[PDB]
Design a protein around this ligand. Structure first.
Ligand SMILES: Nc1ncnc2c1ncn2[C@@H]1O[C@H](COP(=O)(O)OP(=O)(O)OP(=O)(O)OP(=O)(O)OP(=O)(O)OC[C@H]2O[C@@H](n3ccc(=O)[nH]c3=O)[C@H](O)[C@@H]2O)[C@@H](O)[C@H]1O
Ligand SMILES: [Mg+2]
Length: 193
């Protein structure tokens, strides 16, 4: 009857430019952008009894259990029948990914991982610049470095799992936004979107 939603995972390190590029894709393609980090922050800022577990894990650079995050994602997905979805910053974890694959296979068809490859030194500067005009409080050195380790230890393994099935599109993000987005747009255009 109706087609299953296409989902594209957008992965990459802290400040690689995931949210910046997903905003350009929403604009030009009309996909729904779901930042899993933001959805979790919104679950914390409302009550929940998962908040505070969410507060502290987020602050140490840890990955919240999928039983929270996959629910938040599935709810937004359910509410937006008719859309395709950019899920940003997920999956961070082998456990998050297995949960995705066992709870969401029947619902959506997950197309590829879009990986913004970026040097740590540039992501660090991008983030320290952002907090220097008081964007976030996550935007200090202790937090950035913790997230670097979680990315390096846990989420680089998800990426080359998906690369075993030729399911990772890599876009080097160490350029100007417009240089990076031209590649993004052209990819989405060639994928038939
Ligand atoms: N090409 C470019 N050149 C120069 N500047 C560029 C640029 N692109 C962007 N900027 C500039 O870079 C800064 C960061 O950008 P942004 O687009 O915001 O980057 P992004 O990759 O989205 O980085 P973000 O700051 O969101 O970091 P994280 O990916 O670390 O954070 P997230 O919000 O995804 O998650 C935070 C925490 O949530 C938790 N989490 C998140 C998801 C989940 O499934 N589970 C979960 O537990 C984890 O603890 C995680 O550490 C901005 O000032 C921007 O203007
Ligand atoms: Mg983001």
């Amino acid at each position: 009857e109706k087609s299953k939603p296409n989902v594209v995972f957008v992965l990459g390190g802290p400040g690689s430019g995931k949210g910046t590029q997903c905003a350009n894709i929403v604009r030009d393609f009309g996909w729904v952008h779901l930042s899993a980090g933001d959805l979790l922050r919104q679950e914390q800022q409302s009550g929940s009894k998962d908040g505070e577990m969410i507060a502290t894990m987020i602050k140490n650079g840890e990955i919240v259990p999928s039983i929270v995050t996959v629910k938040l994602l599935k709810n937004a997905i359910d509410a937006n029948q008719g859309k395709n979805f950019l899920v940003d910053g997920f999956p961070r974890n082998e456990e998050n990914n297995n949960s995705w694959e066992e709870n969401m296979k029947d619902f959506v068809d997950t197309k590829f991982v879009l990986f913004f490859d970026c040097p740590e030194e540039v992501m660090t500067q991008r983030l320290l610049k952002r907090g220097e005009s008081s964007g976030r409080s996550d935007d200090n050195i202790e937090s950035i470095k913790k997230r670097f380790n979680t990315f390096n230890v846990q989420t680089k393994l998800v990426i080359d799992h998906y690369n075993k099935f030729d399911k990772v599109k890599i876009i080097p993000a160490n350029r100007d936004v417009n240089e990076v987005y031209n590649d993004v747009e052209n990819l989405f255009k060639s994928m038939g979107f």
